[PDB]
């Protein structure tokens, strides 16, 4: 299993090299495409040759050029490595997807940190750090090799260093097996703890972080993701491998029309049920280690805009989020889920007033009134924030317009008391939706603990995903959280 199919560095010659030498026949690799922010290649070895198969991340989907539109790369090759999946060339034939072309490079991983101190290393553990805490830096009083540190357990404590030999382009820790990446040798001890000779075991449980910061600190951490930001957003694509949770619902021929895109499905375990019990939904609750709840959605179809309103009803959420500026192209549908002002609709049992609409510059504002049929005591107040000014292409050059709009959000939603989660969407309701969401959470908890707080935008996400998947499509939406967040601190500051 895992994402090392994924290669982070290499180039389409380095790809064909490794195919045809370290590659059979249904081998295959993924590498970002680079050149274009958001493109990626699959490489394939079929005929004794290499074939190159473009996949396409602008902010909604992945697309497979070829295939069909997943919400991300590990359940891209899932769906064709096992599952129903087929991908078919010009012709007809299969182009088989057998032998994962694993990666040795590690850099991609959160515990490994390159060129960093033994003492520095020392210097994060003890202060961030707790019982099974680990890392693996580069060794430089050989140099060459590896050092991989834990913490164990004032005085209870302690800081343990494994040295990790690099010989022949195999790793080994001074004895028993030898393995072919880093990787490989972390996931075994992993799995198989060392023990100290006096008893202590060396669990390695979680890698130590590198991209919780002080909201304080936080320009004098953009700078440095710019002068990265792709490069801390690899670490994150690289989690992905533990959220194939299974989509099953979704994938039933009975609702497969009620989702926009075939593959693009809400997971069993958080998906909304209704009572025909079913809508491309999850709740989003944000845990850490009384808040305030999101459900992220696609937006709705000619046949779901019902469903859509039961939702909305049966949830008592009484806050949307409407993240695209217009109602979809003729390409794959989508409705008006609202009325006209002054006017009043009815979707299915659910009746609908359109009773003011606000106009602002980013947003409209409409206010409007949701109940049964035949129940006129159902009835309560819903808001739709309209968020109109973001860009067709990438992300907003200003992240004033969607704080703004966030602050606005929040004031409504906790404006009710007992109002049930904030309803955000867009065309997939992965890409935008969770960008606006984790926004909106990160801003949240800096409202909440002041400037002086740590905060940690991959494990939020990640955190995310775990409830829906692919939240957060690209680098571009990464790193324009990293500049709405760092706004709305240097406004707070005022």
Known sequence: TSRRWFHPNITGVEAENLLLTRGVDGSF????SKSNPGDFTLSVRRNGAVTHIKIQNTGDYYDLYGGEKFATLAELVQYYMEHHGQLKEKNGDVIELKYPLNCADPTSERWFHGHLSGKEAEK???????????????????????????????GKSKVTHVMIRCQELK?????????????????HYKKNPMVETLGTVLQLKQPLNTTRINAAEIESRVRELSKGFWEEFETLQQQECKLLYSRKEGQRQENKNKNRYKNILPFDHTRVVLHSDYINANIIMPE????????????????????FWRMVFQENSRVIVMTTKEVERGKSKCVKYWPD?????????????????????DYTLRELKLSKVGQGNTERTVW???????????????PGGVLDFLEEVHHKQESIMDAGPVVVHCSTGIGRTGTFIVI???????????????????????????????????????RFIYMAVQHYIETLQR
């Open 171 to 187: 790793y080994d820790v001074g004895g028993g097996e030898r393995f072919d990446s880093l990787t490989d040798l972390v996931e």
């Open 124 to 154: 994060l553990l003890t202060e961030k750090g707790k019982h099974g805490s680990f890392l693996v830096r580069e060794s430089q009083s050989h140099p060459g090799d590896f050092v991989l540190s834990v913490r164990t357990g004032d």
């Open 288 to 307: 850490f280690e009384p808040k305030k709840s999101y459900i992220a959605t696609q937006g709705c179809l000619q046949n779901t805009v019902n469903d």
């Open 29 to 32: 690799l993924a590498r970002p």
């Open 440 to 478: 909106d959470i990160l801003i949240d908890i800096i409202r909440e603990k002041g400037v002086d707080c740590d905060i940690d935008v991959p494990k939020t996400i990640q955190m995310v995903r775990s409830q829906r998947s692919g939240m957060v499509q690209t680098e571009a939406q990464y």
């Open 341 to 361: 002002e002054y006017a009043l609709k009815e979707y299915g049992v659910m009746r609908v007033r359109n009773v003011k609409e606000s106009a602002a510059h």
């Open 384 to 398: 739709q924030y309209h968020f109109r000014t973001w860009p067709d292409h990438g992300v907003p050059s200003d």
